[PDB]
Amino acid sequence: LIKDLYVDKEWSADYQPFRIAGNLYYIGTYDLGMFLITTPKGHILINTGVAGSDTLIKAHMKTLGFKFKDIRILLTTHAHYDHVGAMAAVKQQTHAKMMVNEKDAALLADGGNSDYVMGGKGSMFLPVKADRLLHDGDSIQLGGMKIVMRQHPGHTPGANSFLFDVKDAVRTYKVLIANIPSILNDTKLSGMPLYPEVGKDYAYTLKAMKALKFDLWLAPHAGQYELHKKHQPGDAYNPAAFSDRAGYDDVLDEWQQIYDKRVKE
Ligand SMILES: [Zn+2]
Ligand SMILES: [Zn+2]
């Protein structure tokens, strides 16, 4: 692996895990979103953090009263090292099935060495082989849960969001775990040498994500959905803290204006 990878202090900073809505729990760090969906047949994990975050995931699950080794399915929003850095460790420890967007499978399996921005300098994370390759609209089912993957390419070719219903004592909530279409500085939207369709994909994703319908949303980075303005440690259960259509439209509109200006460079 590449030595001396950048880690933001907020990526590794501990955060009190909590129940978001129903059987969906937050088990991530101050900045990095890691989501646990619990079922009678085992659990789904969406994302790790950086390498070493398997320890925090195991500890957070214990705090909530769940066993790490009951994770049966592994998912990611996109195959960058801040979201899959501990994915190989988690798969080795749990024997969970890795299910990945077909468009990110090669990137996940080569540890990021093919990354269209950060590649060619060796592995940024331990590689993971896919147990199931996912396509736009594919469903992931376990213990009564149905998760739909939507392809939201650009940030990586295989970047994707997940939509699913959770039930509590009161009502059903449709949750979106949204991969926000952020554009890195080094990206040329007319086409990148290892990703010629990058700008066409980002354009597609900005329109596609605006069209989604849901009750609650979260994202892989706290700042993208203002986690720490919506939630403080010890807050009473309150799913409505994550009802925020205005903030979702505002983040997508900001990225659409960046896209529009960067195309004109
Ligand atoms: Zn990323
Ligand atoms: Zn990230």
Domain containing residue 122: CATH number: 3.60.15.10
Rounded to the nearest angstrom, the distance between the alpha carbon of 83 and the centre of ligand 2 is 6
What 3-state class would DSSP assign to 68? helix
Dihedral sign for Cα 134, 57, 217, 166, please.
positive
Method used experimentally: X-ray
User: Shortest CA distance to 81 belongs to which of 42, 110, 120, 103?
Assistant: 110
Q: CB-side exposure of 233: number of CA atoms within 13 Å? A: 8
Bridging pattern class, strands 97-101 and 71-75 = parallel
Rounded to an integer, what distance in angstroms lies between the CA atom of residue 76 and that of residue 80?
9
Tokens of 138: 């594919």
Cα 128 to Cα 78: distance, rounded to the nearest angstrom: 13
Structure tokens at 75: 């998912």
HSE-CB of 130 using CA atoms within 13 angstroms = 20
Structure tokens that stand for 77 in this block: 């929003």
Chain breaks in the chain (C to N over 2.5 A) after: none
183 CA to centre of ligand 1 in angstroms: 9
**Cα distance between residue 125 and residue 86, in whole Å:** 8
CB-CB contact of 70 with 104 (8 Å) = no
Query: Do 136 and 149 meet the contact criterion of CB atoms below 8 Å apart?
Result: yes
Q: Which domain holds residue 109?
A: 1-265
Distance CA 80, CA 119 (A): 11
Distance 82 CA to ligand 1 centre (A): 7
Distance of CA 177 from the midpoint of ligand 1 (Å): 15
Distance CA 118, CA 124 (A): 9
Paired strand residues for 73: 44, 97
Give distance in angstroms: CA of 180 to centre of ligand 2: 9
Radius of gyration of the CA atoms of the chain, in A: 17
How far apart are alpha carbons 156 and 201 in whole angstroms?
A: 10
Closest CA to 26 of 251, 233, 247, 165: 233
Distance 171 CA to ligand 2 centre (A): 32
201, containing H or E segment: helix 198-210
Residue 47 CA to ligand 2 center (angstroms) comes to 10
CA 18, CA 236: separation in Å to the nearest integer? 10
Q: How far does residue 40's CA lie from ligand 2's centre (Å)?
A: 30
> Of the bound ligands, which one is closest to the alpha carbon of residue 184?
1
C-alpha 155 – ligand 1 centre gap (Å): 6
Residue 47 · residue 35 · CB < 8 Å: yes
Residue 218 burial class via C-beta count within 10 angstroms: exposed 0-12, middle 13-18, buried 19 and up: buried
Counted domains in the chain: 1
Q: Nearest bound ligand to CA 223?
A: 2
* Interstrand relation of 132-134 and 139-142 (parallel, antiparallel or unpaired): unpaired
Distance, in Å, from the CA atom of 160 to the CA atom of 157, rounded to the nearest integer, reads: 9
Region of 205 please: left (phi>0), alpha (psi -120 to 50) or beta.
alpha
Measured between alpha carbons, how far is 217 from 17 in angstroms, rounded to an integer? 17
Burial code (b: 16+ CB inside 10 Å, e: under 16) for 112-137 equals bbbbbebbeeeebbbbbebeeebeee
Q: 179 in helix, strand or coil?
A: coil
Question: How far apart (Å, rounded) are the C-alpha atoms in residues 209 and 71?
Answer: 28
Our CA angle for 156, 265, 219, nearest 5°, is: 30
